[PDB]
Design a protein around this ligand. Structure first.
Ligand SMILES: Nc1ncnc2c1ncn2[C@@H]1O[C@H](COP(=O)(O)OP(=O)(O)NP(=O)(O)O)[C@@H](O)[C@H]1O
Ligand SMILES: Nc1ncnc2c1ncn2[C@@H]1O[C@H](COP(=O)(O)OP(=O)(O)NP(=O)(O)O)[C@@H](O)[C@H]1O
Ligand SMILES: Nc1ncnc2c1ncn2[C@@H]1O[C@H](COP(=O)(O)OP(N)(=O)O)[C@@H](O)[C@H]1O
Ligand SMILES: [Zn+2]
Lengths: 589, 461, 365
């Protein structure tokens, strides 16, 4: 919010109709002029015969305007009926504008309602035989492009309501270079019908839609983003917006995403949604619930071929589209509907943060270089760590399990938190019951990363060993009543695991990444470098966590993961085991 | 062609306009698509005119086409008759449904559920949908030509279906942690301001304490406030030794009003007759339905379970009487829950939001099966050291080292607190402490140096 | 006149009734079957074209179409069985004969009421004979099982067992893939499922050592595999309990409590299992498959040439697994299976047990 956004006390006015933009940009004195409230007051007082059309200098910097409307009815109303009509008109319009702002501009509905219904100004035309007036909401300010977007909703509002004042809303005034007759001036020199100010607003300042004076009672918002039924059913199917899956349920394409019909039915929601892009002679018919259910039955009965879902393992789905792994391109729209994506990370993909440089990417490189130093000793461990974290972006079956082994305060939990903040809902934490002992396995479906945590040192007594039968069962592509296993399974260990039975099929499903960097307290820092289990000791950062849960490093780590994947798992994704690190496997070796 | 047949068949429009005119139309036959804006509509006024309610009209009426509608107006004297409008596009029930959504009285959350705004509070139900109750409630806020037809039940079912099928996108609820919702409004904690009406609407608060807020009690002075200080002074002495425990107690008490995720679990440790259950009852009476007592299952019995699903959006969960887990024949705390009960979303619709302060009362120092450094960071304990015993056994309590003071028991406090006598004074105290500690940041600090089990690890250090 | 439409639709004989109480409809050259969502209405829309236009106009309105399907439901009385042909392979776009190599796509395939399918469209340009793929596939089969004089009875019983995975009847014997590690048992499983598509199923060891979705899911399947029997010969293991082996051979398996067994039960193991009891009925339902080819790495290859459990050792091909998961051998192996089946199980399909290979049976022998 700048000074011009704060307010604009200088006004610009024309003197006739049809002035070319060349004259306006040439500040032609015969047509355009600049005034203030007081200057225009004496101008209109001294020269009533002139015609004055107030507008903006340009739409680039002064897009903020008071919300205004022009009502023109070819009739006359008595005072009491006029009051009833104006009350109904004001309640309907205030509601409609507030709802549009809430659903598009993301503003508070009640704030808009209060600001608009609290204070507004009405004009009055001297033409007795017609009811013509201009309504200006004093305290509500909005950018011009938002009004240009809202003209539609006002058009359907006018076409829908029965109130004559609301039915006679003139939406044509909402367009670039909009000029409105200033109250007190004639429409044309040959017409003697002018507009009259109304109480309690006795000041001319209350009758200009460009005069911006934002006070405590004001609110601001702007648009964030700059037989016949059978024919309707065929038209809907032509858009390829609804599909049948193998599970017997139908997936629909609403809000640029594929959803399930298992909830309250969505086919009807689609049918209402696409009534705008369809010819109006059918759009009239489409809005009765019985006919809409009839069209829905036709659509169900025309869908015979069942299409498999989630066929691409090399695509990362977001809630605003899908990202290609081989490329860095992001698709948002009909390019993403081609890939039948059912789940998503749950957050909008931001191209402004997915750049490469990032104000936080350097500190991310510091954090990753602290948790895993890029040294000649941390060379194979580091690349194994990179590949294991990269495998979480691919939606295919993973054939190996990696054990995250490290001592206390080695950054493993921060690593899980980075991974979850980077891939959204695609990372899930699972308990130890799937190892030592079934919702713990049924909601694992279509997940791309599953983590188990704090194994309670099974080497000592009072523990139920790993029983690698689970490891063999967690490697098969379909998990048992059946679910698709697309999840890289990672295990947190502070102590090396122990297994009851060791087989030749177990060395091919076990991987280990070692963590040996300690983030210690200043007081206990000394007692940190007398231990052989650490290679580097760094000061503990208490402010790191608070940054972590706030999704501060959400997109930089995603960029790192995709860049690693572009290096390692292209064109083939495979995880290789490293049996030579667990001592327990040395025995048979 | 004066008629555009893009809206409705001309015959149907003429049928509608004739139906409006209760009196017989004289020249009905000659109205065609090329004259209906020209020929006056001469009417035989056997009955009173359907528009002006007079005996008859001196001059015939006339039709005009504008904005996809027919305007019916009288010639001669305009003010002598009422202007009439005939629409041509939209099922009237769809217009009503558009108006009702337009008000933002009905919304849907991420749970696939639909919340409504009835009687100044965001009602919600799953077994019995209540959109139609909203329609009855809101019919007063619409013109007459909608209220007259919102009465028939099947029309309301149609409007409900339209509203269901138009509400596509989900909204987020309960985003303000420093707001206390009642059934008649929302109290702000940063200020002392209370919002009742459409002001409480902006905060999508789907839960409530369960009792109406009263401005006549929430003042400061109060008939009950002074003995409320007396009670809180007795339960927690305002002394230099029991000094730090006092603000720790007040912070734990205030952290039950904020609707966010809490980063610690508090233990009320004290002997018998120390007033821990007194504080339990005071909190329950003070915050209504936002306080919930759970069993010991969510500590010792596998979570994934009504006792873990009922804590959805509750701001205080209190656990009672851990049965001496130090001795034999007991199941330990199994700190995996401590890992689980603090992280923001509770699994157990298996996902629920955690806004609850977990307070566990005990007489014995409890033990965990496993002790980890993550337990160092999320456990605080409150010490209670004032005895309220009967006159008979005072000396037997005054010679015990587990008490620093023994006071005479009053038998009438339980009935009075059960009657919500200290309901508002205690809430006032909670707000005062919240402004003292939790502004602008709410976070809880552990006290690892108090649990004896953590001493051994400190002995290791 | 909707009765006339229902009469015509039954005249086309597209919808049929089964003894299970459910209706099957001929949509898109396949005997589609469903219980949750009845498909008669989809059939009516599908065949609305094959009726005089005065009816095709009326079939659009869903109320009229539901009335038509109600009439159809009320017309059908007698059920018409299902899946009576064992020598037919039902594909996704037709059915393939086993006696001949002729493939049907159209009303020809509807005569054989085949409800299950391989799940993939059949290809005419690959099921030829020569194939760039068939050469390497035949070399792979030669490597896994040498075509030698000693590997004559073992190889032929291997071919018989693989052939019997195509016939849709109840089988009379069970064999065990007994062999040491790196011998191609997983390769055989992968090739078999790649060749037969959806008709394959992998199931755990529960249906063997225990008395149940693991048993009712094999309805009308043509191959079931059990894998990694965990050394029942040693301690800490649950013995075979061959009563299940008796139960898995009889045609109608209990586990809707009845299911039709058209699936060959095969277990691949590394160790010879131990049986609870040896009765004379067990002798006629156990067979043995042996593998003696080791696909080892060059480093440990010499240690594989000194092992008495291996006949030949060959160099491991790391990319073969990725190749067979790409189903490149999909139709050549099907060609081999068809040729072996036409060689062995015509005109009679019956499996001969081999009690002489089991060591545990020797004692009563
Ligand atoms: N690069 C870093 N610099 C400073 N502090 C860090 C860094 N990385 C992590 N930390 C902090 O070090 C502490 C330990 O991290 P954490 O991820 O919990 O380790 P861990 O190895 O999973 N621990 P544990 O469960 O005890 O084995 C946390 O407080 C982190 O915020
Ligand atoms: N003819 C062949 N040419 C090349 N590679 C082959 C051939 N046959 C098998 N292989 C590969 O050699 C490896 C050993 O086969 P595999 O099926 O795993 O043996 P196995 O005896 O079932 N193993 P196990 O489960 O350890 O008892 C696999 O990677 C096969 O893909
Ligand atoms: N300040 C006080 N004055 C008088 N009686 C008091 C008191 N504080 C608590 N009491 C009473 O003494 C008992 C102690 O409270 P209670 O919550 O039951 O104690 P405890 N068993 O949980 O340690 C209760 O019966 C309570 O009513
Ligand atoms: Zn009249």
């Amino acid at each position: 919010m700048d000074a011009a956004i704060r307010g604009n006390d200088v006004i610009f006015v024309l003197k006739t109709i049809g002035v070319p933009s060349a004259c306006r940009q040439n500040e032609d004195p015969r047509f355009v002029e600049a005034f203030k409230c007081d200057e225009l007051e004496r101008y209109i007082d001294n020269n009533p015969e002139c015609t004055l059309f107030e507008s903006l200098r340009d739409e680039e910097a002064y897009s903020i305007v008071r919300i205004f409307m022009d009502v023109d009815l070819d009739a006359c109303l008595d005072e009491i009926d006029y009051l009833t009509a104006i009350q109904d008109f004001i309640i309907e319009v205030s509601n409609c504008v507030a709802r549009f702002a809430f659903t598009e501009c993301g503003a508070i509905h009640e704030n808009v309602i209060k600001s608009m219904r609290s204070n507004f100004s009405l004009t009055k035309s001297t033409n007795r035989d017609k009811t013509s007036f201009h309504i200006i909401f004093l305290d509500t300010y909005t950018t011009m492009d938002t009004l240009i977007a809202m003209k539609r909703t006002l058009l359907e509002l006018s076409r829908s309501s029965e109130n004559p004042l609301t039915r006679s809303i003139d939406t044509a005034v909402y367009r670039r270079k909009t000029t409105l007759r200033v109250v007190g001036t004639r429409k044309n020199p040959n017409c003697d019908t002018i507009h009259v100010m109304q109480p309690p607003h006795d000041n001319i300042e209350d009758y200009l839609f460009t005069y911006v004076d934002m006070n405590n009672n004001s609110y601001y918002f702007s648009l964030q983003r700059r037989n016949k039924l059978f024919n309707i059913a065929q038209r809907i199917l032509d858009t390829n917006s609804v599909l049948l899956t193998e599970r017997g349920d139908h997936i629909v394409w609403i809000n640029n995403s594929w959803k399930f019909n298992s909830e309250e039915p969505l086919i009807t929601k689609l049918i209402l949604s696409i009534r705008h892009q369809l010819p109006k002679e059918y759009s009239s018919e489409l809005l009765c619930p019985r006919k809409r259910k009839t069209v829905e039955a036709n659509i169900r009965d025309m869908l015979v071929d069942s299409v498999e879902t989630d066929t691409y393992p090399d695509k990362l789905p977001f809630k605003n589209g899908v990202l290609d792994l081989v490329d860095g391109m992001f698709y948002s729209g009909d390019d993403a509907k081609k890939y039948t994506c059912t789940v998503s990370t749950g957050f909008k993909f931001d191209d402004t943060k997915f750049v490469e440089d990032s104000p936080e990417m350097e500190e991310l490189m510091n954090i990753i270089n602290d948790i895993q130093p890029l040294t000649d000793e941390n060379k194979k461990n580091r690349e194994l760590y990179e590949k294991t974290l990269s495998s979480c972006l691919c939606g295919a079956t993973k054939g190996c399990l990696t054990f995250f082994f490290g001592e206390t305060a080695t950054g493993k939990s921060t690593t899980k938190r980075l991974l979850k903040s980077a891939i959204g809902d695609l990372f899930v934490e699972t308990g130890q019951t799937i190892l030592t002992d079934n919702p713990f396995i049924a909601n694992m479906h279509l997940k791309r990363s599953v983590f188990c945590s704090e194994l309670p040192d099974f080497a000592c007594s009072g523990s139920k060993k790993i029983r690698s039968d689970n490891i063999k069962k967690l490697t098969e592509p379909c998990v048992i009543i059946n679910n698709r296993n697309h999840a890289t399974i990672i295990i947190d260990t502070n102590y090396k695991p122990v297994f009851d039975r060791i087989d030749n099929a177990l060395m091919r499903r076990i991987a280990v990444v070692r963590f040996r960097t300690h983030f210690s307290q200043p007081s206990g820092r000394e007692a940190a470098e007398n231990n052989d289990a650490y290679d580097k000791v760094k000061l503990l950062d208490e402010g790191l966590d608070g940054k972590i849960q706030n999704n501060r490093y959400r997109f930089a780590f995603l960029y790192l993961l995709v860049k690693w994947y572009k290096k390692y798992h292209i064109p083939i994704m495979k995880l290789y085991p490293t049996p030579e690190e667990i001592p327990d496997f040395a025995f048979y070796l």
